[PDB]
């Protein structure tokens, strides 16, 4: 039988989608940075259960463990950053990613046009996307504890994709998928990826494991 699927298609904020035009119109030099931005993220995700679970134990029953993977595809070009953190409701995701306008995007692209590095993207409040310095579409699954499991998809463009996910259920958290653009590769060699984590990544207060597939 035909499954059926409810999907929402949201405009980008018109500063949000701006910013994106800009981070994938213009050539940047530490482009690397894009995966310090995703792992601080999840960092702050996995603060927030941890002090949640001391009030209330029960919020660990979708699994104790607080840690970070991440996982290199070579054969289909993807880069997942994943971690068993917070997660987030559909509020949290429609209000986080993309609809609600961001106090610091308009300063952030003055900042930028007047040549700044991508590097302080961060300190904007709006991290998340120097993902689309590396990947031409982003996919992020999300769970968090009082909510179902949602997909939210962007290649840009000015939309976005929000869907409850009927995919592979993952106890609570986030995984970001990162559809890598073909001249941006080398975020899937092992070496290079222990590079920048070792480089932008060495104050995670969490474990991080790399997966690498046998060649
Ligand atoms: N990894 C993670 N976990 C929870 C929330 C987020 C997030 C994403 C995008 C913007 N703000 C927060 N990322």
Request: aromatic share 8%; net charge negative; glycine share 6%.
């Amino acid at each position: 039988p035909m499954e059926e699927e409810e999907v929402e298609t949201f405009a980008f904020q018109a500063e949000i989608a701006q910013l994106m035009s800009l981070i994938i119109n213009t050539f940047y030099s530490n482009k690397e940075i894009f995966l310090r931005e995703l792992i601080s993220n999840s960092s702050d995700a996995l603060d927030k259960i941890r002090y949640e679970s001391l009030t209330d134990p029960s919020k660990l029953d979708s699994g104790k463990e607080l840690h970070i993977n991440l996982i290199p595809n070579k054969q289909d070009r993807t880069l997942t950053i994943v971690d068993t953190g917070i997660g987030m409701t559909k509020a949290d995701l429609i209000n986080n990613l993309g609809t609600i306008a961001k106090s610091g995007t308009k300063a952030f692209m003055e900042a930028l046009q007047a040549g700044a590095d991508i590097s302080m993207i961060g300190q904007f409040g709006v991290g998340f996307y120097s993902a689309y310095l590396v990947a031409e579409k982003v996919t992020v699954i999300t769970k968090h504890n009082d909510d179902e499991q949602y997909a939210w998809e962007s290649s840009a463009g000015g939309s976005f994709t929000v869907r409850t996910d009927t995919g592979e259920p993952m106890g609570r958290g986030t995984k970001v998928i990162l559809h890598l653009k073909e001249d941006q590769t080398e975020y899937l060699e092992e070496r290079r990826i222990k590079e920048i984590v070792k480089k932008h990544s060495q104050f995670i207060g969490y474990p991080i494991t790399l997966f690498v597939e046998k060649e």
